[PDB]
Write a protein that binds this ligand. Structure first.
Ligand SMILES: CC1(C)CN(C(=O)Nc2cnc(-n3nccn3)c(Cl)c2)c2cnc3cc(Cl)nn3c21
Ligand SMILES: CC1(C)CN(C(=O)Nc2cnc(-n3nccn3)c(Cl)c2)c2cnc3cc(Cl)nn3c21
Ligand SMILES: [Ca+2]
Ligand SMILES: [Ca+2]
Ligand SMILES: [Ca+2]
Ligand SMILES: [Ca+2]
Ligand SMILES: [Ca+2]
Ligand SMILES: [Ca+2]
Ligand SMILES: [Ca+2]
Ligand SMILES: [Ca+2]
Ligand SMILES: [Ca+2]
Ligand SMILES: [Ca+2]
Ligand SMILES: [Ca+2]
Lengths: 365, 369
């Protein structure tokens, strides 16, 4: 029987490039792939918009989980490049033009995966190439794609336009389709595209293979808790203001580095006729435009989470970039309230601290 | 809207290697893709077990159909190999070891397709590579300079065992799945198995193209005429016939096209007069061109002949004979239908025989020898 010792996954989606065309596609594709992998018993990390430093720390810690018998999946979506056989994943902080030292190399990660003694390695790259970056003419000089169980997947589109066109739609990502078709148990648009799948398997492996489950393992507890504690969300607060008004502050995870906050009035005393609550004062590291806070749908914040997913009728705020948090997520719930019978509006302020939510816990900036 | 000026396809499936491990997979995959393409309004040729001479003629004549705006699909399944940046399709007569002179080069065919003013080229290869071909040459190339309106697809498995395993099942061809998902506008099952495997799909499209795009039936009337005629001249199947034997017994003799180079023949008694108590009929005397063992003729299912066709597809209650290799027919398909009959009241089994000529069925009508 093929068994997994563990099932671990790291998904990266880069979009918000400083010096390169911004992408949109990754967000959806990471979310849907996360959601698939959860149902296959994977512990997933899902990170949007990483710098070089962030990507390296993330990938290394993924690689540290790949012991003997582990099933490991790595996914990247975003800009990439190719030179002399060597492919590169570009972080959001990379300058223009691309230099190798600003980028993470595919083949290095692949070589590291092949040393680890895993039961299955999966490495899936969905890359936007620059228009005129075709594959180079090369000899093959070095390989490990025999000695360990590998599925390697490499999609390309030439240019951001063709990339975004082919990725348009929900539920439709190339690798999610591949996984569903090939590893359990969207029309061809204009432009230039490529897909490469390569595999070397000594025996049939599938994502659906059972974990060798444990009753009393220290290692398995370690593994579980290392991941689970990187995914602590704040408990919902019922914030009581001095006038008697109660604002519920709720929290949702969207990615390992994205939290939705949402606000609702849950008590209005008879002495108050009208009230509004809003959030402000977020840490500058997280970099929120208040134009994208306090919105009347989660959709308006840029969330994948829709109005049917979250509690309804709130104001919604998306706090992305949690990996950049230095201290605590200190922010302010404000209350505006009008007293019953008066025109007079009062303001009040309640500072909230929620600690280090999600990957912010690691404190690795 | 994109239009095709025509839809033409050539499918080759090579299995019966003389000097190389035999394959089984191609039969099914060619049949099922042929069926799909038929339903999309392609004129299809489907050929099993071609020599180099046969492959070259077929491919060349396929390339002749690729006029302006035509949609052309070439599919190959069987052995391939790689050498110094080139890739090769191996014909069934290929010497061991593989030498380029004996094989058809993928890169040639790809550039021959890209030279045409077609509206869409599709070129799909689904190959076995022998393990020995992994270790002998340093790789360079396999990608290609995929340009024009082209969809290049290229799949490999290392070794016949892994190849056959990955292809086990009906309905489960990688390229059929691909075309259905990616190239039809609409206007589990293939589990990844052991071994070393590769897939490469490349597309270049100046505008959206699909296999479902309607045929523009205007312009280029003589080219259209010739395409249609040439194809249809390669697909004349003989009509079903009733042979009346002089004793009164009626043998039905039916025909089915399995590939452009494979015909099923089937026989049944459709009338026994009351004077005959028992009878049986069989076929014999096929031309030596077609090779066929008489122990593999006269079977009680089409499954027993080696066909894709199951007992659902043809008339039940017959004997079935499969004639492959029709492209090698140098003359007419002449055979004998035999009858054995016992009269009521007699111990005597009488024999009778009738000769049949059905001409040159299917691709044999091209007369290429
Ligand atoms: C939870 C762990 C063990 C940790 N990890 C990370 O990605 N760590 C990470 C570390 N530092 C930064 N950083 N931010 C700022 C600067 N450095 C970042 Cl972004 C991430 C992954 C990654 N993949 C999987 C999979 C499974 Cl299971 N656990 N797991 C983990
Ligand atoms: C019917 C035509 C026009 C012809 N053709 C062939 O394959 N010709 C062919 C010629 N010679 C041999 N041979 N046998 C013995 C020796 N030489 C063989 Cl096997 C085949 C194809 C091939 N593809 C498509 C597609 C559409 Cl439409 N027509 N079409 C045609
Ligand atoms: Ca390049
Ligand atoms: Ca290298
Ligand atoms: Ca650096
Ligand atoms: Ca998508
Ligand atoms: Ca700190
Ligand atoms: Ca006031
Ligand atoms: Ca012509
Ligand atoms: Ca020759
Ligand atoms: Ca070779
Ligand atoms: Ca099959
Ligand atoms: Ca007698």
């Amino acid at each position: 029987q093929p068994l997994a010792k563990d099932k671990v996954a790291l998904l990266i989606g880069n979009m918000n490039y400083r010096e390169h065309p911004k992408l949109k596609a990754p967000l959806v594709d990471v979310y849907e792939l996360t959601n698939l992998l959860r149902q296959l018993d994977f512990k997933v990390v899902s990170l949007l918009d990483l710098t070089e430093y962030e990507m390296r720390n993330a990938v290394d810690e993924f690689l540290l989980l790949l012991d003997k018998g582990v099933y490991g999946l790595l996914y990247y979506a975003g800009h990439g490049y190719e030179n002399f056989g060597n492919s590169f994943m570009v972080p959001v902080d990379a300058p223009n033009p691309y230099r190798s030292e600003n980028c993470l190399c595919v083949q290095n990660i692949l070589k590291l995966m092949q040393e680890k003694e895993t039961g299955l390695n999966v490495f899936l790259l969905d890359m936007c190439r620059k228009r005129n970056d075709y594959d180079d003419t090369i000899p093959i000089l070095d390989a490990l794609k025999v000695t360990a169980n590998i599925v390697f997947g490499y999609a390309t589109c030439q240019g951001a336009e063709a990339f975004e066109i082919q990725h348009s739609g929900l539920a439709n990502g190339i690798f999610m389709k591949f996984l569903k078709d090939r590893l359990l148990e969207c029309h061809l648009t204009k432009g230039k595209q490529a897909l490469e799948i390569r595999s070397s398997l000594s025996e049939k492996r599938a994502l659906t293979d059972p974990i060798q489950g444990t009753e009393y393992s220290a290692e398995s507890l370690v593994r579980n808790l290392q991941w689970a504690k990187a995914h602590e969300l704040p408990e919902s607060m019922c914030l009581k203001f001095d006038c008697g008004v109660q604002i519920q502050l709720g929290f949702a995870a969207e990615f390992s580095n994205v939290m939705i906050i949402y606000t609702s009035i849950v008590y209005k005393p008879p002495e108050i006729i009208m009230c509004d609550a809003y959030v402000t004062d977020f840490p500058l590291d997280l970099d929120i435009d208040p134009k994208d806070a306090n919105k009347g749908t989660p959709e308006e914040t840029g969330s994948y989470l829709v109005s049917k997913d979250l509690p309804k009728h709130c104001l919604y705020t998306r706090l992305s970039s949690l990996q950049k948090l230095k201290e605590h997520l200190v922010f302010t719930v404000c209350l505006s309230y009008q007293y019953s019978g008066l025109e007079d509006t009062v303001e009040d302020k309640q500072e909230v601290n929620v600690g280090k939510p999600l990957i912010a816990k690691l404190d690795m900036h």
